[PDB]
Each structure stands twice: as structure tokens, then as C-alpha cells.
């Protein structure tokens, strides 16, 4: 086909995912002579091939003549490292790479320059997609949403913030600063530390900006979804539960808190467990003074704030409660016990009532009411589930009162929504907390694939081409593996019912049901305990050991009624006020939260932003191939290029096509009538190329073939010109030697 001497090729390499190569001698039809500093290289039953250098650095990654992982990686690399352009496009999908030191680029003059004009005309930027949302809302009168996704620390929150600053500056009427000032609260309650960075955000946060009929900004409304609350009770090594607990413990030396009798961070069972009481970047006692300012400036009264902190310390002290077993059947609390005593005195509820209700459970039918002892295991489950329920209701209550501080009672014609959510993820131990995140990204990228397919089908209507050239990958067979009536989340929640349940038996029940009944579920070769799911991004392996103990929530209604009974301070009844819901396991409350989130996004036509983290070590403004490839695969950008490469990825206006190729093609032809012959002259068949009404559609490689033959021809022209002017100039040198 084509592989020829002085062509360039990309070679796979262990150190950096691809390396530049030059092809030293032409190919002929199993082994190649290459230069890199010399190696011969080999083929097994062909290497990837490299775009012409003038296209490298081009603005939209779809534009490239050859579309493959090496080219996308390089075009990002050079554009970030040399040119210092972070924002990039693939199709409709913006791609963003955090410069990780600040830049002029976000200033107001750039906001103005991005206002009012097509995002395809201007250079790619977050302002460009924000402006397209702002336009499409008024063009259609359909609400618009923005979806921001990546690894922890990729710049999701800062991308959201700049979209907010854009809306504020375009519309100009304050809501903006209250929205910004909400962030320290939502971090402190909602962010966590993980083995791969601090300040991961373990929930998904949606800001609704609402508009006047003339699209001026009236007010802002906040929602949250997919919160992850196993982290309250349970933490893996070098993890932390939510920051607020550490900030609180750090407070304890200060007189206002003092009556809570907080310990140090190691003291309490919940903060103890992860093993990282101190964090290297943040002075943790210092941070909350910012939280308490943010509460004050956002309309949470000093009356409420101490009630919050009293509830959190309540949770910690509850957690430190210790159970003495009697028997297989029964357990008890030791006769006088300090971490329950202080707990009750914080909350007010009578110690002797809680000591009974923690340890036993009621069950009654109208004739007869019965009280059972429960084992130490179920008592510990109950205690932890109660902690998770208090925490979830506190989170909801704080979000509600922030909403009350953001809302204005003014009426809303449409809204734009800006959404920040953890990206698809893989770590080299995976456990139910991470399995949920991966399943949520399955749904969001169902929506993504169905939308991008629909827009290409519409573009092929707008400029007439048959549908059949389009066909697309769909991830419904995987969601049916996770979410349907015998899916992993269903067999998991079943064993929470089962009389004796354990990871050893749940794994087995999966294998029996799934293992040869599917092609997406596969057993990791050397283990019974793990199982592997072939997500759209990757094969991912999960360890069953975590799931059942994290999975389980049941709060015994007595312990809530006993908390509601408090008269000491009024917040605590106020949380519960607003059943079948109490029985629901975490897996089920997650499925139903994601079904809400999809009910909210399916109402709306999304735009997308993706953020990728250059490097593990937080080095400024430099890039490591070996992460980036993984990130770009986890964004689905690589399946986006692979699908487009299967199609007609490069679009050309007839006018730019004329401009570039006129130097190739002859004056005898004179501008679609020219192309009608010239394209068949140059290229064997229409299968390579479509004529659309105002555009041309090429199968990927062909544009490089054009550029190559154009450059060869122009070199021939320039060579002949030089040699002609040399001939007479040498006749001048002859006349000078005569002189």
C-alpha cells in the first residue's frame, strides 16, 4: 500500500507509549529497517503511520488525516508543551488539560471575544462551549447542560468556576459570588482523601443557573447526587473519611467546641481507621475558619452551625461505642460506658433508653409486640447504618439551606446546568465504592454515545448522505449486566437478605449465574474472590471482599424515634422530619439516585468537557504519556477517534479545498464542478469521498495522500526553478571571470 523510505512511523515502546520513527528503506511484501539510533523491527500476523507535520498542532483532534492513539497523544503533547494551549476539541467534546499554573487566558477581554460568535470559528476554550450553551438555549428554548468529568484533581471544579464567571460576565446581574462561596462547605462535607490524591470529591454536584425570558440571570439552585457514604464508617489504608471530621477534631482545643469533648484525630474509631490523621498540604485546624466563614456568608446562622458540629461529634462518639458480646444470640453494652454517655449528653436523649434500643430491636404485630436480642455483628451493622443515615440527612439539610440562600422567589423561563462528577476510574485494587463510580459513568456514556450518534445522523440529513455509513457502539449490554434484575447489584443486594452471606458465596453465585452466560463478565484467571467486568474503557477487576459489609444499610426505626424524641436542641428533630426506604441497601439508594440524575439530564441536550491530569507528582505544566493514554481511554476519546476513523472523519469546505488543491490542479478546470472530475482523477473511487452540499467527506488517510503528492509536486517545481535561475546566474559568473 504505502510504506516507503523517508516516511515516518510511530513505534510502540515500553518507556513512553509511542516513539517517533523514520523508515530508512522502503517496505516490500516481515521486517523493516528503521531509524530513531538504528533498529530493525518486525511484524506479526502493521505499524501506525504519522500525519504530515503541518497538520500536527491542528486545532481539532478529529481534523487529523490519520486518527489513532499515537497521533492524538502527540497532537495533545506538542500543543500543550510547546504552544501552551490547554483547551482542545474532539468533535463536539472539548478536552482540557490543567496547566497547573495560572494563565492570562481567563480574563474579561477573552470573555468578550468569545461572546456572540461560533465556537468553531474561535479557538477552543471552556468559554466557547459555555457560549454555545447560552446560544442554543435561546435558539431552541430547551434547557442546556454541561458535564465535566475526569480524574480527581483534573480541574473539574475550576472548569465549573470559569463557566460560572462566563455566565456572570455575559448576563450581568450577587448570585455569582454566593455560588462560588458555597464551594468550601460542599468540599468540607463532601470531599475526601484517597490513595491517589487528596481532595477527591465523592459526590456529584449540579448547579442550575436560571434565566429571565430575556436570559438575564435571576438566581441559582443546587442539587447533589450519588453521594458515597460507606466512607463514613469504612476506609481503606491511607484513606480518610470526609474532611469535616478532621477539621472538627482539629478544633477541639478551642473553647466553643470544648463541651463536645472531642479527642485527637486518632482517638475515634472513624477517624482512626484509615491511618492518616495528618495531611501534607493543608493546615487542617486552619481550614475550617474558612468553612465557618462560608457558612456565615451563605446564611446559615450561628444557631445552626454549632448544632451541626454537635451532630458530627455525636457521630464520632457514637462510633466509639464498644459492644460486649454475651452469646451467639445476644450482646450488651458494658454497664457504665463513656463513649455512649457523652454521646447521649451531647444529643440529650436518655442514656438508659439508647442503651436498650442500640442493643435490641423491636418487632410487632397488632396483637403482639416482641423484643429480640441481636448479635454483636448485627448491632455493629445497625450502629454504622445509623451513622450513615444521620450523615446523609445532615448533608441533605445543609444543601437545602444553601439552596434557600441562593434562591430568589422570581420565576424561571429556562436554566443552564453545570455538572461536576467523578470520571471513570481504575485503580489496582477496586471495591464497591469504585464499582459504583464506574457504573455511573456507564450511564453517562450511554447518553453520550446516543447523543453523538444522533447528531451525526442529523448532520447527514442536513447535508445528504445515507445513514448506513453510520453505525455506533452501544453500552446497553453492560448496563444490563450491572443494573438488570439479575445483575451484579441485584445478586449483591440479595445476599444482604440471605441467612448466611459472605464474599466467598456471593462470588460463587455470580460465577454460576453470569460466568458462561455473558461475554462482558469474565473470571480473573488466578482467583475465585475477584471478578472482571469489560467496561467500555477497559477490563476492570473488582475484589469481592469489600462489598457485602459496605453494601449493608438498615436503620432500626426505634433508634430514629429515640433520636427524634430529643428536646435539648431543635436541629436534630428538624433533620428527620421531611418506612420502606430504611430497608434499602446502599446499592439500591445509589441506583435510585442515578435514575434521578438520568431523569434530570435526559430532559436536556448536554454539552461535554473532559479534564485529564498530566502527571502523578503534581509537577507544573509538564506531561507524562503513560497516564495520559489511560485518561484519554477512560474519557472514551479513543473510541471516539476509532469510530470516526471507521467513518469519514475529515470534513472539508469546498472553498478551503479549492484553495489548498488549486496549486495541484490545472487551470483547464474551473467550485464543485472542478472537483467532479479532479477527485476521480486523483482518487480511485467515491467510496473514498462524498460530496455533500457545501462540504466534502474523506476516509481518513486520503488527505495525507493529497498532502504528500502536493508536496512532492511543489518540490519538483521549486527544484526546477532554482536550477533555471542557477543556469543564468552561472552565465553571469562566466561574464565576471571574463571581467
Amino acid at each position: 500500500e504505502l510504506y516507503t523510505k523517508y516516511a515516518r512511523v510511530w513505534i510502540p515502546d515500553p518507556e513512553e507509549v509511542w516513539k517517533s520513527a523514520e523508515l530508512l528503506k522502503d517496505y516490500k511484501p516481515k521486517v523493516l529497517q528503521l531509524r530513531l539510533k538504528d533498529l530493525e523491527y518486525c511484524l506479526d500476523p502493521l505499524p501506525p503511520l504519522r500525519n504530515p507535520d503541518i497538520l500536527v498542532g491542528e486545532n481539532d483532534l478529529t481534523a487529523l488525516s490519520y486518527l489513532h492513539e499515537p497521533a492524538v497523544l502527540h497532537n495533545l503533547k506538542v500543543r500543550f508543551i510547546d504552544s501552551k494551549l490547554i483547551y482542545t476539541y474532539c468533535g463536539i467534546v472539548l478536552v482540557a488539560i490543567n496547566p497547573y499554573e495560572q494563565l492570562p487566558i481567563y480574563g474579561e477581554d477573552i470573555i468578550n471575544a468569545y461572546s456572540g460568535q461560533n465556537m468553531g470559528d474561535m479557538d477552543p476554550h471552556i468559554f466557547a462551549v459555555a457560549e454555545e450553551a447560552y446560544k442554543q438555549m435561546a435558539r431552541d428554548e430547551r434547557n442546556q447542560s454541561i458535564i465535566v468529568s475526569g480524574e480527581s484533581g483534573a480541574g473539574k471544579t475550576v472548569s465549573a468556576k470559569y463557566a460560572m464567571r462566563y455566565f456572570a460576565t455575559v448576563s450581568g446581574s450577587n448570585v455569582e459570588e454566593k455560588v462560588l462561596a458555597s464551594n468550601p462547605i460542599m468540599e468540607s462535607i463532601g470531599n475526601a482523601k484517597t490513595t491517589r490524591n487528596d481532595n477527591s470529591s465523592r459526590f456529584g454536584k449540579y448547579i442550575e443557573i436560571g434565566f429571565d425570558k430575556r436570559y438575564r440571570i435571576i438566581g441559582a439552585n443546587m442539587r447533589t447526587y450519588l453521594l458515597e457514604k460507606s466512607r463514613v464508617v469504612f476506609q481503606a489504608e491511607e484513606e480518610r473519611n470526609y474532611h469535616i471530621f478532621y477539621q472538627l477534631c482539629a478544633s477541639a482545643a478551642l473553647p466553643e467546641f470544648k463541651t463536645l469533648r472531642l479527642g485527637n484525630a486518632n482517638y475515634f474509631h472513624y477517624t482512626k481507621q484509615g491511618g492518616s490523621p495528618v495531611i501534607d498540604g493543608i493546615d487542617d485546624a486552619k481550614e475550617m475558619v474558612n468553612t465557618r466563614q462560608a457558612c456565615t456568608l451563605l446564611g446559615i446562622s450561628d444557631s445552626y452551625q454549632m448544632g451541626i458540629f454537635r451532630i458530627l461529634a455525636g457521630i464520632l462518639h457514637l462510633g466509639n461505642v464498644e459492644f460486649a458480646s454475651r452469646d451467639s444470640d445476644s450482646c450488651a453494652i458494658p454497664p457504665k460506658h463513656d463513649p455512649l454517655t457523652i454521646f447521649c449528653d451531647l444529643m440529650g436523649v436518655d442514656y438508659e433508653e439508647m442503651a436498650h434500643w442500640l442493643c435490641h430491636r423491636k418487632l410487632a404485630t397488632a396483637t403482639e409486640t416482641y423484643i429480640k436480642p441481636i448479635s454483636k455483628l448485627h448491632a455493629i451493622n445497625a450502629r454504622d447504618a445509623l451513622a450513615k443515615h444521620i450523615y446523609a440527612n445532615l448533608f441533605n439539610w445543609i444543601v437545602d439551606h444553601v439552596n434557600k440562600a441562593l434562591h430568589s422567589t422570581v420565576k424561571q423561563h429556562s436554566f443552564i446546568g453545570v455538572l461536576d462528577i467523578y470520571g471513570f476510574e481504575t485503580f489496582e485494587i477496586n471495591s464497591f465504592e469504585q464499582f459504583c463510580i464506574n457504573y455511573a459513568n456507564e450511564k453517562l456514556q450511554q447518553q453520550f454515545n446516543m447523543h453523538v450518534f444522533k447528531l451525526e445522523q442529523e448532520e447527514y440529513m442536513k447535508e445528504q448522505i445515507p445513514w448506513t455509513l453510520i453505525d455506533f457502539y452501544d453500552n446497553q449490554p453492560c448496563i444490563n449486566l450491572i443494573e438488570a434484575k439479575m445483575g451484579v447489584l441485584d445478586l449483591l443486594d440479595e445476599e444482604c437478605k440471605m441467612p448466611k452471606g459472605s464474599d466467598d458465596t456471593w462470588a460463587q453465585k455470580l460465577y454460576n449465574t453470569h460466568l458462561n452466560k455473558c461475554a462482558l463478565f469474565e473470571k480473573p484467571r488466578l482467583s475465585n474472590k475477584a471478578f472482571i467486568i469489560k467496561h467500555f474503557a477497559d477490563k476492570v477487576e473488582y475484589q469481592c471482599e469489600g462489598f457485602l459489609e459496605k453494601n449493608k444499610d438498615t436503620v432500626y426505626e426505634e433508634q430514629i424515634k429515640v433520636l427524634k424524641s430529643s428536646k435539648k436542641f431543635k436541629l436534630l428533630p428538624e433533620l428527620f422530619q421531611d418506612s420502606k426506604e430504611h430497608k434499602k441497601t446502599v446499592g439500591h439508594q445509589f441506583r435510585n439516585s442515578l435514575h434521578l440524575l438520568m431523569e434530570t439530564l435526559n430532559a436536556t441536550t448536554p454539552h461535554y468537557v473532559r479534564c485529564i491530569k498530566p502527571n502523578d507528582f503534581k509537577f507544573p505544566f509538564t506531561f507524562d504519556e503513560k497516564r495520559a493514554v489511560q485518561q484519554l481511554r477512560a474519557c472514551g476519546v479513543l473510541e471516539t477517534i476509532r469510530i470516526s476513523a471507521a467513518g469519514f472523519p475529515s470534513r472539508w469546505t469546498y472553498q478551503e479545498f479549492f484553495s489548498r488543491y488549486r496549486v495541484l490542479m490545472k487551470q483547464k478546470d474551473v467550485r464543485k464542478q472542478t472537483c467532479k472530475n479532479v477527485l476521480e482523477k486523483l482518487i480511485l473511487d467515491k467510496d473514498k469521498y462524498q460530496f455533500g452540499k457545501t462540504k466534502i467527506f474523506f476516509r481518513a488517510g486520503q488527505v495525507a495522500y493529497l498532502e504528500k503528492i502536493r508536496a512532492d509536486k511543489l518540490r519538483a517545481a521549486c527544484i526546477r526553478i532554482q536550477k533555471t535561475i542557477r543556469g543564468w546566474l552561472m552565465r553571469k559568473k562566466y561574464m565576471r571571470m571574463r571581467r
Binding site: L363, T365, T367, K372, K485, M486, K497, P499
Partner: protein, 371 residues
């Protein structure tokens, strides 16, 4: 949707929804007909009363039980009980909700066939299943492994289950039951010159049995002591305020469970059938059947039956092996709670016998699919 779970003892209907914590309806499974002349023209008239109606009016009524020893003995009474259960008591249309039904381990197959036919033809429940009660008691008590002694109003049966395998040769059935403690109780109360000779009156006897019976921790001692002098003797109020006074005798009925020689039953007491059941079992399992004894069903509710069992089976077992008895205070319900758990397991959804599959298969399907 959520299945219905409905349990027919001889002695109660217990019904409610799958995944509910405790049954939504309990009432005695008893049908009463008026026997006397109705005088008052324009007063209400009914051809039958069911449950707490027949309770409220019993003096005027012949009360009869449709179920004798877990066998449904005439079907229109039963049909009328189920009708009252779904429509009046639970207010649920059965067509919308599948149903789960409960049976003693050895009773005739015709019971299952008729119980199926009435469910599909009369109510058109979407799907049905039938479960052996002793299987359900393990679900209720959170165990995979145990021997269950389960004793109802009409039947007592043993089923050993090791690690999810029932073991059918092991399985034993006695007809000592609450009803046939009561039918003895009347006859010995005659020794004190009280007589209770009609079914409405007989239920008063059963209220005596429920309130004042207890099990002798050892029987010859108290039979000597109370006869010598009685502190123990205690006295009960009939519905008209007559006080009647019962001495040694209140233990003598529970003892029939341990000595069917009184009633003239061939068999040995429940302790010796429990031991002979484990002796039928393979010696490998027996160590764990001895530890997980589960008591089930209301006839077990008599105070001290737990400790009388723990004591008396220990004498039969070898000393090296050790005996533990489990009698949670809710055990009367447990056969229903186990059905609440079983009906909600996601794997169970394949288990069910479905209107299409019945309509093709004939009601004999319940033997083939259900067990």
C-alpha cells in the same frame, strides 16, 4: 410488584406482603354458621362469619375448622377464608400480586393440587409456590444448618437441613398438636368438675391452655409436690365471671407432648423423635444438627419447653457431643417471616409457577416444579 405471602396453619391465617417485617393480618382460621332461629325481621343476616367475626359472636355459632392436621378437609370453607383474606382483610386484588403458600411436609398431594387449582381458577394470581414450613423456619432464624422441630395447631414435624440440603428420609411427622392438647385438657378438667362441651366453649379452654399451661422441668417431682400442698394452684375467669381454679393439672397437658401414652398415641414424645431423626442422619452432619436445634411454631410457646428439651435430649445424646436449643421469642411467626424472606430473594423469581405454565401443564405441575 411484591408477592403476597399467606400461611395456613390449622390454627391461624397469617398473611401480609413480601418484605414486610411481621404479618399484616392474623385471625383464627375458623368459619361459623348461625344455628339458632333468627327472630328479629330486619336485623342483619349472614350465611357465614369468618375470623374475628366468628370470634366476636361465637356463642350463637357452630364453629368449625376447615383444616385438620394440615389437611384442608372441605374446600368451600377454605375458599371463603382465602376470599376474606385477600379482599376483606388485606384489601388487595390477587390478580395484581403473586402469592406464596405453605404446607406441612407429608400431607397428601391432593392438597397441593386443589390448593393450586383454586388459586389459578378462582383468583387468577399471576404465580404461586408452595413451601415446606421447616424449610422456612431456617430462613427466619438466619441459619443454613439445623434440625427444626415445628409444631402447629394441627401437625408436628421434624425436618433436618444441613447446609441447604434437606434430607427427606430423615423426616418424621406426629399429630400431637395444640388442638389435641386442648381435646385432652377438657377431659382432664372434668376431673375437677368443669365441663366444656361445645366448640364455642372449647375455645375458652384453648384460652385457658394459652394463659396458664407450663412445662414441668421434671414431672414426677411437681406431681408429688403440688398434690401434697399447692401454692402453685391458680385460678381463671370464665367470660361470665365464674372463677375456676386449676392446680397440678395445668402442667399435665404440656406433658402430653413428651408422653403420648396419656392420649394413647403410639409414638414417642417430641424429644425421642428429635433424637431418632438425628440418628437417621449421617454421622458426619450430626455434630452440627445437635447444636442448631430450632424450635418453631406456637405449640412450642409453653414456658419451659425449651429447657425441658435441652435437658431431656442431653440424656439421649453422648456426653461428648453438646446440645444447644434456639427458641427466639418471636418463633410463632417465624414460619411466616421465613416466607417473607424467601419470596423477596431475586433468585426466587425463577422459582414461581406461572399462569401460562400452569395453563399448559395441568395442576400436577406443583409436584414437578415446586417441591
Amino acid at each position: 410488584t411484591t408477592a403476597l405471602v399467606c400461611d395456613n396453619g390449622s390454627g391461624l391465617v397469617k398473611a401480609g406482603f413480601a418484605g414486610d417485617d411481621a404479618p399484616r393480618a392474623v385471625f383464627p382460621s375458623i368459619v361459623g354458621r348461625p344455628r339458632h332461629q333468627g327472630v328479629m325481621v330486619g336485623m342483619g343476616q349472614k350465611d357465614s362469619y369468618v375470623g374475628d367475626e366468628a370470634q366476636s359472636k361465637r356463642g350463637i355459632l357452630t364453629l368449625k375448622y376447615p383444616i385438620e392436621h394440615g389437611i384442608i378437609t372441605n374446600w368451600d370453607d377454605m375458599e371463603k377464608i382465602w376470599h376474606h383474606t385477600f379482599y376483606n382483610e388485606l384489601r388487595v386484588a390477587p390478580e395484581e400480586h403473586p402469592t406464596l403458600l405453605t404446607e406441612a411436609p407429608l400431607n397428601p398431594k391432593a392438597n397441593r393440587e386443589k390448593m393450586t387449582q383454586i388459586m389459578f381458577e378462582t383468583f387468577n394470581v399471576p404465580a404461586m409456590y408452595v413451601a415446606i414450613q421447616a424449610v422456612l423456619s431456617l430462613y427466619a432464624s438466619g441459619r443454613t444448618t439445623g434440625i427444626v422441630l415445628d409444631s402447629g395447631d394441627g401437625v408436628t414435624h421434624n425436618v433436618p437441613i444441613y447446609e441447604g440440603y434437606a434430607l427427606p428420609h430423615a423426616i418424621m411427622r406426629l399429630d400431637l398438636a395444640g388442638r389435641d392438647l386442648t381435646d385432652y385438657l377438657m377431659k382432664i378438667l372434668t376431673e375437677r368438675g368443669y365441663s366444656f362441651v361445645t366448640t364455642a366453649e372449647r375455645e375458652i379452654v384453648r384460652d385457658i391452655k394459652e394463659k396458664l399451661c407450663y412445662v414441668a422441668l421434671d414431672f414426677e417431682n411437681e406431681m408429688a409436690t403440688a398434690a401434697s400442698s399447692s401454692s402453685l394452684e391458680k385460678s381463671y375467669e370464665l367470660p361470665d365471671g365464674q372463677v375456676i381454679t386449676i392446680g397440678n393439672e395445668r402442667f399435665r397437658c404440656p406433658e402430653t407432648l413428651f408422653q403420648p401414652s396419656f392420649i394413647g398415641m403410639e409414638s414417642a414424645g417430641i424429644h425421642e423423635t428429635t433424637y431418632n431423626s438425628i440418628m437417621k442422619c449421617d454421622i458426619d452432619i450430626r455434630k452440627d444438627l445437635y447444636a442448631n436445634n430450632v424450635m418453631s411454631g406456637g405449640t412450642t410457646m409453653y414456658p419451659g419447653i425449651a429447657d425441658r428439651m435441652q435437658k431431656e435430649i442431653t440424656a439421649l445424646a453422648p456426653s461428648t457431643m453438646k446440645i444447644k436449643i434456639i427458641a427466639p421469642p418471636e418463633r410463632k411467626y417465624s414460619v411466616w417471616i421465613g416466607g417473607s424472606i424467601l419470596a423477596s430473594l431475586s433468585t426466587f423469581q425463577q422459582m414461581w409457577i406461572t399462569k401460562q405454565e400452569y395453563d399448559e401443564a395441568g395442576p400436577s405441575i406443583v409436584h414437578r416444579k415446586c417441591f
